[PDB]
Amino acid sequence: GAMGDSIKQLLMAGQINKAFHQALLANDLGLVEFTLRHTDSNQAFARLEQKVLLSLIQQISADMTNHNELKQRYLNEALLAINMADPITREHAPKVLTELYRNCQQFIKNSPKNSQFSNVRLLMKAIITYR
Description:
- It is classed as gene regulation.
- It is a single chain.
- By secondary structure, the protein is an all-alpha fold.
- The chain folds into two domains: 1-46, Helix Hairpins, CATH 6.10.140.270; 47-131, Orthogonal Bundle (Annexin V, domain 1), CATH 1.10.220.100.
- It has eight helices and no strands.
- The chain has helices at 2-13, 16-25, 29-38, 41-44, 50-62, 69-81, 87-110, 117-130.
- It is globular.
């Protein structure tokens, strides 16, 4: 619809953060996934604002009942893109990562057979380093 269309438009224009603002302010993880499906990861992760990265981390991990490779790989890349020299990130990241951790812990208990199981376990180790 109108949101997805606008998002595809923004992304083609190279207005990547504006596309993600729209996707992330909609409170719709399906629209976020649509957005991730149409964005060039080598544009995204070359780049996305720190505030966008921390929100994406939040939103993807808030609901991991249908966690997958696309979202895991973005969780991976978004974490690796966290810039701990950014004073806002330095204040806000601790909280976002603690909740990411807590959600990953619930995911590995809920979904032991899931394809992303060991990937999330590895992510939880990486998180410890950021924290």
